[PDB]
Amino acid sequence: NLTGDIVIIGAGAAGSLLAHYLARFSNMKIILLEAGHSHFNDPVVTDPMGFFGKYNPPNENISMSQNPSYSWQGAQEPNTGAYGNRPIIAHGMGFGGSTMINRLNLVVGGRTVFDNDWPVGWKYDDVKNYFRRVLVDINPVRDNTKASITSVALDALRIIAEQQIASGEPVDFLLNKATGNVPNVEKTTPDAVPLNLNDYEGVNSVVAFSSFYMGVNQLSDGNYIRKYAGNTYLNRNYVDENGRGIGKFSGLRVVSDAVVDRIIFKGNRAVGVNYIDREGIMHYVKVNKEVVVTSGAFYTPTILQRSGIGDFTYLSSIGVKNLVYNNPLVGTGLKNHYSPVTITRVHGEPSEVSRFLSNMAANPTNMGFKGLAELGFHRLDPNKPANANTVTYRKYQLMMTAGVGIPAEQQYLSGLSPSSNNLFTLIADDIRFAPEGYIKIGTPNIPRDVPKIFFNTFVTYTPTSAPADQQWPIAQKTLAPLISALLGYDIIYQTLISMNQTARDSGFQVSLEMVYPLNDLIYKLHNGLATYGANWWHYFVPTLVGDDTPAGREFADTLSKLSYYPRVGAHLDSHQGCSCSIGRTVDSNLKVIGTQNVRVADLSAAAFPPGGNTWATASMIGARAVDLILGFPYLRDLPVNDVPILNVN
Amino acid sequence: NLTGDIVIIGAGAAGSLLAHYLARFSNMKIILLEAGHSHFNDPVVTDPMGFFGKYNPPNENISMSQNPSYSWQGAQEPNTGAYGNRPIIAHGMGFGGSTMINRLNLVVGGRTVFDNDWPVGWKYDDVKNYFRRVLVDINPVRDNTKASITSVALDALRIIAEQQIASGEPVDFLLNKATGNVPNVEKTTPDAVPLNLNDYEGVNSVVAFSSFYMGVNQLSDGNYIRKYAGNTYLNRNYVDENGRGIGKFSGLRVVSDAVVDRIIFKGNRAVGVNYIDREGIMHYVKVNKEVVVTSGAFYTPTILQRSGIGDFTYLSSIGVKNLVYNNPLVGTGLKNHYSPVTITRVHGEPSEVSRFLSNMAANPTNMGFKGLAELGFHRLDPNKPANANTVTYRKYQLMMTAGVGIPAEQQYLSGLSPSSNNLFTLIADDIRFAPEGYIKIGTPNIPRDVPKIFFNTFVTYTPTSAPADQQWPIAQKTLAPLISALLGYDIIYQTLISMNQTARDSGFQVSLEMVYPLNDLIYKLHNGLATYGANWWHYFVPTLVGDDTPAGREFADTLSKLSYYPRVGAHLDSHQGCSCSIGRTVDSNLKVIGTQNVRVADLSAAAFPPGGNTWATASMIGARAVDLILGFPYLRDLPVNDVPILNVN
Amino acid sequence: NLTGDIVIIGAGAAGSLLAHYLARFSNMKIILLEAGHSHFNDPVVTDPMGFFGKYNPPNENISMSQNPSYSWQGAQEPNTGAYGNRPIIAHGMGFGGSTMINRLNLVVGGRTVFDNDWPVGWKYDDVKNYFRRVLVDINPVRDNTKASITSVALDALRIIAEQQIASGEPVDFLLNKATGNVPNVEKTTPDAVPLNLNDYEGVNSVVAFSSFYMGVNQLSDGNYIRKYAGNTYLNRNYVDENGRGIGKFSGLRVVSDAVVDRIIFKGNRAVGVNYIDREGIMHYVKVNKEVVVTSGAF
Ligand SMILES: Cc1cc2nc3c(=O)[nH]c(=O)nc-3n(C[C@H](O)[C@H](O)[C@H](O)COP(=O)(O)OP(=O)(O)OC[C@H]3O[C@@H](n4cnc5c(N)ncnc54)[C@H](O)[C@@H]3O)c2cc1C
Ligand SMILES: Cc1cc2nc3c(=O)[nH]c(=O)nc-3n(C[C@H](O)[C@H](O)[C@H](O)COP(=O)(O)OP(=O)(O)OC[C@H]3O[C@@H](n4cnc5c(N)ncnc54)[C@H](O)[C@@H]3O)c2cc1C
Ligand SMILES: Cc1cc2nc3c(=O)[nH]c(=O)nc-3n(C[C@H](O)[C@H](O)[C@H](O)COP(=O)(O)OP(=O)(O)OC[C@H]3O[C@@H](n4cnc5c(N)ncnc54)[C@H](O)[C@@H]3O)c2cc1C
């Protein structure tokens, strides 16, 4: 009963697309099991303002990500590098996966991030068509309400970019080699050409723009809707309430509220998978040809290990009765970003400061994401690729936001009350984040929301009684995240001083200065950078360098004092992935090593995170997997003018 | 397949006692459920000192209650009173349940709690026999190693109590009505017998002692061992490897790797239970007579909601098929305590302060804490019952530990070194916490670590359009935790200010100061308390009092800033319970209201949180359930000299 | 009752390997009797620091070798050549034999020690594969923390070795003939090639190195474990708590806490062996084809 040539686990960001383009482009019987259910008529999801809690009950006013009925609750172990706290990250449960609860921003990643870090047969020129297909299928829209702050910021970054171009340094964070001598920045003219950060040819690596492309749409009424995988690939036009396909998709048979705990094996090939229905009773599903797993970043290692594939020593220590294959790499090598935050306050006359921040309110067409640029490398960064003098990378993503987005305790401590209406927010984050972790299960019975999740982000360095030059490379490798965070702070400071001069030039007689990071510290950091140079981070370890000069010890105190911001004055970005990268757990065909008929086709099978937000990465993976499993480039050849018909239901 | 006359859910503290004492007096089939595995040869759990991290790997040094392979990770919903933090409370996963991961501390809770806060048939004069049986079964041992600060604290508190009892105040925190106006402090003379806090007749409610009691056990070699509930009642001296007992224990069988799904009903009566093993095969165990669900104060309500007992509307919306009985109050009123930490500094010459703080190291007979007393409510607290003037209660719990117990971020912000010996922690645990919460399920497919659990601790008040005379009771009732915490702060300050002169008299030429809570602020708190008398609490809200005196503004600011510390400079102890309290889901005979033959014997059935640790209360509930289901009072009159026996192998 | 084609006495350093590779590579019924029992979940054994007494009770702080519950107590006669004293030597009792209480160091022996002193059919070229099999099965690991003293010592021995080579004497203690004129000493360079004293071809007879190969391993947690015969050849994957093999090793039936005092004979062939169980009562074991004894040196 309930057989299937291809069995798909989870209707995540790639599961829905895989099921759709697999049922349509073939004639086999396909069955999909998803833990969540459709939310097509849920006002909290469809309305973009539901992210801010416009439909919450009065006595249960919690966020959608913190609701265990919408997402997995992945509580993590205490963090040695984050002052011994236990933050909780979530994965959206339901059709579309984590695209039901995100902030609806799309980035493609770039050209170099796929050209260098990815293995052969996987570069940008092979996934360009899949990326374009995904983007046109989503069909995003830019921001509609334009503000005066954005033009001033654009001209400021333009001035900084032209100064850096005239400088002659090898690489900086406003240098786009593929463009040329002309700075890669948008124009402040009201009739400027809208510059895109997702160009089809990948010519824009680091560049300043005016807006991103939200995953929203405007309806005939005037209401805005949320566009994501669920309402783009698996609407009512294809699957009914009985979970059956119609038309040429009749081979698909999707089952909702179905979580699968284990894949049954015959020793080296899969024969069936079992799930538990809403009755609380178990069920059996028989697999014919292959098994597809789309369980997301944090939870494909668990389903792989619990099913019998993984480190046999630790699995035996846990108590796994049935063992299949032994790799010491299952679940290791996952990556995630981190977003330090800064707050800038404007001082002046009330009218001028009220007019300066015009057109900033949270709107469904932007969700507060005005955005500035995807910045690159710092001039003082020690940890840079060897071939940096040949290509330009992506390291930072500068985005502007209204209000003061900071944890409440830090808001009270710093005094930045949201009642103040003369301040805004800009965020610089790291997309090539260094620190790494691991996931291990604790019980081989059922997939639980809390496995052993060790993630230490900003660790320190303990000097030893060894020669300094012998140990310095180790310290440089270890202290990368703090270096990146402080370089981001310096970049924000340069952008801010350019903002001040440009705003004074543009007729607004106001001044913008940093207040949140205790500007004394930031100004001292800038002075120390200028007076020291490439060896600025040597004083991160005070007794190792042993300068013992008042300037040197004061800089050591400043560096130790400023390390608290990157650790506590931010919130962790939920872009985890790449826990089963190609070569570690799967080959270049996304098939498991040593196994015969199991395939994994989500973000968990990514070699390295992209140079941007990873919405399109998962779907793209699925798209590629569609033609890898079918055997012909059916999906990649389809013309650009073919999008699934969007049904609101 | 299996058959069982009486089924007990959860091999925990009360569950194991229930199972052993039920198979002891009869020969009917008994089945005990437990999903983990054996831990009889694990040094971390067998050795009592392994609780503090004796054998933890250096790379993964975490507490045993923070390890997913040892316990469930029941993260709760954000707390609106502490900047939205989500503390995580754990339930043990193994033989003995939560008795495998605790401190083994034994406290009864006095007699007034069961004199006024428990229903008829649950009074102290009826449960004292069960409490004594539990205490003599555990067989604790008193502390042996002695420091030289306990006598100083006892003498200072003796002076304070003498002054207070001679003052003639109506009620205070150092007066006991069951002994007399003579102060009840342990004599510092070396020829004084100790006054235990667990007297069989409950003579002492507020009592000053020297140490606590702990459920460790002694070996022939000299090594100390842990004899937990699953080790005292379910060890190999009574039950074999396979499960079949011999002789009078032949009616007991324990299952392994069994995690339940739901109890199948036949309309109103329990007919069977089910669970899933490692392989993933469900086994139907039919129940003949009764089902006792005592799987914990966090997951018994969960399995009851899956059973179909709770809110019909919510269960129907979520997707629960079978509805058995509707009870809106199921899993409501969850109760737990709270404890803020503080740091005291010692001043003087290094040698004298070093010898002053000597012999203060954790061992299997102190568990780090020294312990002083358990005081009552203060002289200015407006939150008291009517019976306060006729009988004393147990409101606060004071302990002293070595080192510093304080969050690492708080350590950095306060700038107090952990390596320094001269700082010790003076914590005032509150055992009469005001607020309560409830529990709901998220997804009816499989058991999950994180259900919906709500708990708000520091709910602040906001002015509303109403006269102050008709508003003040609301502010009084809303702000109870803050008043209790600040009065505890004042109690600790008084204790230390007396202990200064007491230590000066004792010989040590030292001075002790209250550093971490900003002694300036605590001194201001004491001065304002003494100045404003019974009307001080009106100043928490500055707009309502309507006094524009600069001293009033200063006092209001001092009250406001001092509220920050209890949110972050504290920790929420894992003594949660009272979710299915007597009179809401169960009645005096523990039969669940609505069903036929179902009973709850966990800690969630407590009618009120006792003034202390909660293992003894749960063991008492299980012991009472033994005789309630047996029908004859065998355990109520069992001789004290008849005790179980333990076997290591 | 309790018959067996091959009867093995004691699960010593060779008994466990013999039982494993005999039950797996044949189809006869094999039964093993061992005086000790498994210590797979004993922190004193698994933890390498248990050798220094990190888990001893306060009132019984004695070494693991001096504990009669872990090893035989072979007290010796007074020594005329050692000033009339009676030192006591021990043999580890249990799975793996004396490998439960040793200091976890592995040496192969060399080429000449087997080439000269051993009889025909037993030289190094006949036992090379067995030695390599044993070494790869144990899979030892070198030292991880390097010290400054070792480099200074290495260069000192290098200077002494080159002086002795230039001397021209017949044989000395830094002269490796199989190497040549270049001294057989490791290099003090931080990026030196790790020289091995257990080379597969036996080219290193006398040579200076940087570390041996401990019988330990590093776990995913970070904890170190003791690697020896018991946890290398007779784990839970092959024998259960009932002492029965599983899979292709089902012919094996091991009995723990079984000491055999005598082998019964029919005049020139063995017919059975008898042991005493933990009850303190005797038992009879019948031998079918041969008897194997692995009771150790003493
Ligand atoms: C607050 C927030 C904001 C974000 N903003 C952005 C943004 O602006 N831009 C961006 O690019 N990304 C953003 N993200 C991240 C983005 O939502 C996802 O990380 C991205 O879709 C990649 O993850 P995924 O979809 O592959 O994982 P998912 O597909 O979401 O992984 C979980 C899925 O697997 C299924 N599943 C898992 N285990 C099982 C099982 N055992 N049985 C059955 N089904 C199972 C679940 O049902 C679910 O469908 C944001 C995330 C969060 C939390
Ligand atoms: C960290 C910590 C410290 C503590 N310290 C103290 C102290 O110092 N003093 C004190 O008096 N008390 C202390 N306690 C409390 C003590 O543990 C009490 O026993 C507790 O309050 C009540 O335990 P219980 O009997 O309800 O446990 P139970 O809930 O009965 O034990 C849990 C059992 O239920 C089983 N189980 C749960 N869910 C399922 C399922 N779905 N399927 C199958 N089996 C299941 C588990 O396997 C386990 O065997 C502490 C508790 C904790 C967590
Ligand atoms: C402190 C110490 C450190 C050491 N360090 C090293 C080192 O670094 N390197 C190294 O190579 N060696 C070392 N050794 C020596 C090594 O442990 C052994 O000598 C080596 O394993 C060779 O002995 P064996 O294993 O064959 O003897 P064993 O096999 O240990 O001999 C005793 C075995 O025979 C069994 N047995 C004996 N009589 C009976 C009987 N009547 N009935 C049943 N069973 C019986 C016992 O149960 C036990 O299994 C060390 C020894 C000690 C004591």
Numbering used by the authors:
A (entry chain A), B (entry chain B): 54 to 702
C (entry chain A): 54 to 351
Sentences from the paper on this structure:
Mimivirus is the prototype of the Mimiviridae family of giant dsDNA viruses. Little is known about the organization of the 1.2 Mb genome inside the membrane-limited nucleoid filling the ~0.5 µm icosahedral capsids.
Finally, the 4-Å resolution Cl2 map obtained after 3D refinement corresponds to a 6-start left-handed helix made of a~8-nm-thick proteinaceous external shell, with six dsDNA strands lining the shell interior and leaving a ~12-nm-wide inner channel. Compared to Cl1a, the Cl2 6-start helix (G) shows a difference of ~2° relative to the fiber longitudinal axis and ~2° in the steepness of the helical rise. Further, some intermediate and relaxed structures were also observed in which the DNA segments appeared detached from the protein shell and sometimes completely absent from the central channel of the broken fibers. Both GMC oxidoreductases (qu_946 and qu_143) can be fitted in the 5- and 6-start maps. In the Cl1a and Cl2 helices, the monomers in each dimer are interacting with two different dsDNA strands. Density that can be attributed to the FAD cofactor is also present in the Cl2 and Cl3a maps.
